[PDB]
Symmetry: D2
C-alpha cells in the first residue's frame, strides 16, 4: 500500500530563478518608494544579458541598472570564469506604463477594501502534516539541499561551488486514511555548477556527506537510497549561459512541487493587486491554518472568486478524508475566521511591504518569516 | 452537498504568451523540416514591436529566423499598426547560440537512440477523465473551443471585427461521483476578445452570446442563471504584445488540464524530444487516456520523474481517485508491462521528430485527434 | 578656370538623421530639468527598433519611451504602411551613468569659466560669402530641398511623400582670388520615399516644378542642368527598414558638406561640456563674424586647444587670400573680440538651453535662429 | 610668420568605436570568404557586455555570427571581466535582415559588373602630401604608429600591463612652403591607454616616453619643449565598451587623413564594394597618391560624387594647393585619361572582393603597404 512521489527545486543561480529574483527585486524597489505601485516586470536572462520587459506605473524613481546588478551580485555571479558577471553584463530595459486598457477596469478610483476582481477564481492552496513546515517532504528537502549548497559556497567550505544548481527528491509514501506518511527517501538527484579544478570524486563525496547527510534526517536514509550525484558528469558551464532564463518558469518549484494543484499564474514581478499572487498566498494561509488547527491532516483549498463580487463566490475544501468534520463543516469555520476579499488580504498579510525578493527563491511556501506561513488561531 | 465549482481558462493565438509558444514551435518545426535530430531549446519574448528569440540550438539546418518568425505572426493575423502589431515592420532580435557542450556530453552524444538520457531532470504528469468523449475536463475543453470558434469566425469573415488576442474562462458546477466528477451546469463564462474601434459593444456581446457561446456549449449545460461576462473589463482595442510582455512557457496549465490533475513545471514549446519536459508529458497523457478509454478507470493521474543523463524514469506513480476495481499498485503493474517511458523509445512510439509541433502550440496540447498521444494503445494484461 | 563641387543632405526621415534627432531630443529633455546635465546618448534605428545606448548623469527624470516616440511622431512615421510607427515600435534603453573614470578628470568640482580641457584642439570653422547664409551654395540648396519636401508632405500638397529623403547638389564654380563664385547648378539628385500609388512620372514632375524650381533661384538653372530625380526607380521601402541608422553618421551633412575641414566628432547626443560640439559652434561663430564683418570673403578657422589651458593655445586663420589684412592681423582682431575659453563659450552662446533637437536636421550651420549664426559686431 | 599648429588623433583596436569598425569588417570578410558577390551593410554597436549586429546582408554564405564576433573580440584582447569585457561571456544580439529589394533593383540586379550603379549617393575625397614617404600627413602617421606600437608591446609581453583601449593625439608645428606644408617639430603628444590596477603611474609614463614615443617619432621632431600628457585624465582602469557606447563609422577622420584634406561623410567598415562610400574613396586615395608619387604635385585633393544607380561619377575635382606647374584643370584631364572611377571597374583594379578588409579597420585605411590603393599607378600623359 505504498507509492512514490518526486519534487524538484533550484538554487539562486538557476537562470529561470535568477529572473524571479530580479523581477521581484524590481518590485521591492518600487514598493519601497511607492506602496501603491503597480508592477508587472518580466526578466529574460541569456549569456551576458538581462532584459527587463513589462509594464510599470509608479511614482518611484528606480535605478534599474543598479537593482539588476545588485541582485546578480547577491546570487554570486561576479566573474567571467563563472559564466556571468554583475559588473560587466548587458542590462536592457523595455519597461513601459501599465497598459491603459488594463488600468481603467481594475484600479483607478476604487475603494481598496471593496474591490471585487477583474478576473476569475481558480487559485489553490495546500497543506500537509508530514512536515512541521506543513509542506510535502519531497520539496522541503529539495529546497533545503539547494540552500545548504549556497550556504557552503558563500562561507568558503566548498569554494569550488557555483550558483547554478538543481535538486530532485523522491520519497516513498504510505497512505493513511487520505493522509500520507513518509517512510524513507527513495532517490536523490543533485546537479551543481562547479569549478574547473575539483574532480568528480571529491564533489560526489562532499554532496553526500556535507550536504545530503546534513539536510536529510538520517531516519529517512538507508543503504537502499539511490544517489544521482552530478549525473551529467561535467557542469562548469551554467547560469544564463547554459539555458535561457525567464520569469515564472519554476511555478511548481515556487508552490508545492507537484502536490495539490495550480491555476497557472506566476508570482514574481507582480504587485499585490494581481490576484494570481495575493489569493494564492491566502489559500496557503487558510490551508496551513486548518492543518495546524487540528481540523485535518491534509487539505486542499480552492477559492472561486468572481468579477463583480468582492467576497469569494465559492470555497470548496478537499480534506482528502483526514477530518472528522465534513468538507462543509470546515466551510463555516473558514468564513467565520477568514475574510478573503482581495483588498482585505493585502491588509491582513501586509502585502504592501517589500518582502517579495525573499520569496523568489527556495519556495514561496513553507518558510518561517512570512505572513502567510503563521497560522491564524481559529475560533469556532 | 457533494457539489463544487471548478474553473479553467484558455487564451487565443493572439495572446502574448501564446504568440511566444507558437513562434518557438514554428522555429522547432523549421529545424525539424531539415534536421530531424535537431536540439532545439528556443524561447521567445514578445513585447511592443519586438519578438526576441533566445536559447540554444544545434542542428545541421539553415533557417531564416526573420522569415519564420514573421510568417508565424502573419498567420496569427497581426498585419497592421491598427491592431497593435505588424509582422512586416516588427523588430526581430536573435540571441540564439549553440547548446551547452556540458549538457550535450551527458544527454545524447555517442549513445544510440534507445539510451538517450533525459535532456534535463524534472517531473511530469498525465491525466484523463471520462466526463468528455476526448477524456478531458469539460472546463478546459469548453474554454479551448471558445477561443477556437472566435478564430474560426474571425478568419472566414463572419465577424470581421475580431482581432487575434482573446481569453476565456469557464466555471462549471460539478458533482462528486464515486471518485469521478460529473459536470452538471456551466456556472459562469467570461470572454475578452480584441476588437476594432468602429463596432459597438451591443453588437459584440450579442454575437458573443449567440454565434460562439451557443455554438460551442451544449444547451443542457446552459440555463437562465449562468453569468455572462462578455467584454467585462470594458474596451479591448489594445491587445497583442503591446499590452503584456509575453514569454514562452507562461501558459503551461492552459496547455494541459486547466488546473485538473497536476503539473511538474516543464513547458512544451520550443523543445525537441530529448527534453523530457515535453515528451514524457505527452507519454503520460497517452498512458492516462488509454487507461480510461480501456475501461480500467474513470479518472486517473500518472506521474513520472527523470534525472539529467539517466535513460529510465526515476519513478512512476498511479492514482485513480478510487474510480477502479483494481488497486493503484495493480494499475502501476499494468502500465509498466505495456509502456516504455525512456526518452529514446517514446520518440519511435509517437513520431516525435516530425515537424507537427506548431499545431499543438494553441487550444491545448491534449484532447484533440491527429495527435499520436491521443489515439489510445490497446493494453495487454 | 572653373571647377565642380558637390554636397549632400538628408531629410528628417533618414534613419541616420532620425537618430540625431532622437539623441538630441533626449538631451533637450535632460537640459530642461537639469541645465548641468551630462549627456552622451547614442541612438540605433533598425526595423521597428529604437535603441538608446550611452551614459547620462543627471538630476532629471525623463520618460524615454515618451521622448523617443514623440520624436518619431514629429518626423512623420506613424503607420505600418510607411515602414515605421511611433505607436508600435520597440524602444530599448541601455543608458547608464557617465563613466566614473570620465567624470573625475573633466567635471566634478571645477569652476566653470576656468575649465581648460580634458582633450585636445582640432576643431574647424568655415564661412563663405557665396550665400547670404554665409555657407556653401551646394549644401544650402541641398538642405533646402529636403525641407521643401517635408513642408509639402505635412500640408498635404504632395500626400504621397514619405519622410525618408536624400539630396545632392553639384555647383559649377569659378575661382576669384581665393573666393569662389557660383555661376550655375550643374547636377541635382533627389531620392524620396513615396507612396505605393503615385507613378514615376508624376513624382519627377512634382520634384522639378514644386520642389526644385521653388527652392533654387532660376538664375542658377539653365537648359543644361542635369536632373537625377528618383534615379533608383522605386522607393516605397525607407526609414530604419531600408538602412540601419546611427547617431553621428552624417557629420558632413551636419557641417559644411565637404568644404572646410572636420575633426571627427559628432554633435548629436552630447551636452555643452563636450568640446567637440561647443567649440565647433564657436569656430563657425568666429568664421561668420569675419566674413560678415567685411574682413574676408572666405575663411577657415582652426582653434588648437590644450589640456591644462583654458584659453586657446593656438588660433590659425586661413583666409584663402580673400583679405587685405594678413592671416595674423586677423588674429589680433579675433582675440580682441572673442573669448574662446570652453566655459565662456557656453555663457556667450547660451548652450545650456534645450535647443539641440532643432540643430539635428537640415544642418547645424547656416540657419537663422541660432546663437552661433548671428555675427558679432567686431571692434578693432 | 607662415607657421601654424595642426593636430590629428588615432585610437587603438580596443577603443569602442574601432571595436565596431573591426567587428563589422570581420563579418564582411566571413561573407566574402564564401560569397565574393556578397552585399554587406553590417553595422556594429558596442556597450557594456553587448555587441549588436544590425544592417542588411544578402549573400549565399552561412557564417556563425556568435563565433565571428567573439573571435574578433578575442583578437583585440578582451578575454576577462577584469578588463571590462570578455568574448567568452558577452551578449551578442543579431538584428541583421536582407538588403532592401528597392535598393537591389536599382544598384546591381541584372546588370553586368562594369555597369553596377553606385550603391548610394554621396561624395568622397582623396588626399596625398609629400611630407612623408607614405604620402600622408605626419600628424596622423605618428598617431597611428603610436597605437600600433602600444599593441605590439602589449601582445609580445614587453608591457604586459597594457590593455586594448588606447587613444593618441599628435600636434605638429608646420610651415607653409609654396603651397605644401613642412613639418618642423612635434609640439604636443597625448597618450591615454588602458592598464591594470597593480602598475604605478610612474612606471607607465616612464615606459610611455622611452619605449613607444621615442621608438616611433624621429628624434629631430622631439626637443625639450614638446609637451607630454601621458595618462592625463588620471587613472584608466575602466575601458572598452564599458565606458563609451561604440558605433560603426564614428572614427571616419581617424580612418582617413586625421583632419587634413576633406571628407564626404561616408564610413568604410561593414560595406562591400558596391557602396561607393568605401570603394570610391579608396580609388581617390589611389589617384591622389599616384599624382604625388608621380612628381605632378606635392599636395593634392581630389573629389568624386555619385548618384544612387548611376555608374559614372557625377563630378570630379582636382585641387593642388598651388604645388604644381600644371593647372588644376590639366590635372583633371590627366586623371580622367588614366583612371576609371565606375564602381564596377574599380573592383577589378583593386581586388576589392578579397576578404582583406578587417586589416584596414584600424591604424588608418591609408598610408600602409599591402593595400592595392597604396601602390601607385604609372600614369600616361
Ligand atoms: C538542461 S537545462 C535547459 C536545456 C537547454 N538549455 C538545452 O538546450 O539543453 C536546465 C537546467 O539543467 C542544469 N544543468 C545541469 C547539468 C548540466 O551539465 N548542465 C545544466 O545546464 C542547469 O541548472 C539548467 O538550468
Ligand atoms: C542606400 S542606403 C544604405 C545602403 C544599405 N542599406 C544597403 O544594404 O544597401 C542609404 C540611403 O539611400 C536612401 N535610399 C534611396 C533610394 C532607395 O531606393 N532606397 C534607399 O534606402 C535611403 O534614404 C537610405 O537612408
Ligand atoms: C491578464 S493580462 C496581463 C497584463 C499585465 N499583467 C499587466 O497588468 O500589464 C493579459 C491579457 O489580459 C487581457 N486584457 C483584457 C482587458 C484589457 O483592458 N486589457 C488586457 O490586456 C488580454 O487578453 C491580455 O492578453
Ligand atoms: C572621449 S571618450 C567618450 C566617452 C563618452 N563621451 C562619455 O563621456 O561617457 C572615449 C575614449 O576616452 C578615453 N578615456 C580616457 C580617460 C578616462 O578616464 N576614460 C576614457 O573613456 C577612452 O580611451 C575612451 O575610449
Amino acid at each position: 500500500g505504498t507509492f512514490l512521489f518526486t519534487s524538484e527545486s533550484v538554487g539562486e543561480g538557476h537562470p529561470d530563478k535568477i529572473c524571479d529574483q530580479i523581477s521581484d527585486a524590481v518590485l521591492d524597489a518600487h514598493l519601497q518608494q511607492d506602496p501603491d505601485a503597480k508592477v508587472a516586470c518580466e526578466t529574460v536572462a541569456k549569456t551576458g544579458m538581462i532584459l527587463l520587459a513589462g509594464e510599470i506605473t509608479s511614482r518611484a524613481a528606480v535605478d534599474y541598472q543598479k537593482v539588476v546588478r545588485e541582485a546578480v551580485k547577491h546570487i554570486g555571479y561576479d566573474d567571467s570564469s563563472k559564466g556571468f558577471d554583475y559588473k560587466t553584463c548587458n542590462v536592457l530595459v523595455a519597461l513601459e506604463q501599465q497598459s491603459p486598457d488594463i488600468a481603467q477596469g481594475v484600479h483607478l478610483d476604487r475603494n481598496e477594501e471593496d474591490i471585487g476582481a477583474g478576473d476569475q477564481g481558480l487559485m489553490f492552496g495546500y497543506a500537509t502534516d508530514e512536515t512541521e513546515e506543513c509542506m510535502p517532504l519531497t520539496i522541503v528537502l529539495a529546497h533545503k539541499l539547494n540552500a545548504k549548497l549556497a550556504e557552503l559556497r558563500r562561507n568558503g567550505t566548498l569554494p569550488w561551488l557555483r550558483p547554478d544548481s538543481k535538486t530532485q527528491v523522491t520519497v516513498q509514501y504510505m497512505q493513511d486514511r487520505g493522509a500520507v506518511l513518509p517512510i524513507r527517501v527513495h532517490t536523490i538527484v543533485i546537479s551543481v555548477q562547479h569549478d574547473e579544478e575539483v574532480c568528480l570524486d571529491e564533489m560526489r563525496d562532499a554532496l553526500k556527506e556535507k550536504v545530503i547527510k546534513a539536510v536529510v534526517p538520517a531516519k529517512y536514509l538507508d543503504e537502499d537510497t539511490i544517489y544521482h550525484l552530478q549525473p551529467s558528469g561535467r557542469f562548469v558551464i551554467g547560469g544564463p549561459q547554459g539555458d535561457a532564463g525567464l520569469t515564472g518558469r519554476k511555478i511548481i518549484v515556487d508552490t508545492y512541487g507537484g502536490w495539490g494543484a495550480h491555476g497557472g499564474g506566476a508570482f514574481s514581478g507582480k504587485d499585490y493587486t494581481k490576484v494570481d499572487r495575493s489569493a494564492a498566498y491566502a489559500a496557503r494561509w487558510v490551508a496551513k491554518s486548518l492543518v495546524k488547527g487540528g481540523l485535518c491532516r491534509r487539505v486542499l483549498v480552492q477559492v472561486s472568486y468572481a468579477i463583480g463580487v468582492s467576497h469569494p463566490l465559492s470555497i470548496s475544501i478537499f480534506h482528502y478524508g483526514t477530518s472528522q468534520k465534513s468538507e462543509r463543516e470546515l466551510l463555516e469555520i473558514v468564513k467565520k475566521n477568514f475574510d478573503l476579499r482581495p483588498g482585505v488580504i493585502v491588509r491582513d498579510l501586509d502585502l504592501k511591504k517589500p518582502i517579495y525578493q525573499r520569496t523568489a527563491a527556495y519556495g514561496h511556501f513553507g518558510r518561517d518569516s512570512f505572513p502567510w506561513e503563521v497560522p491564524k488561531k481559529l475560533k469556532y
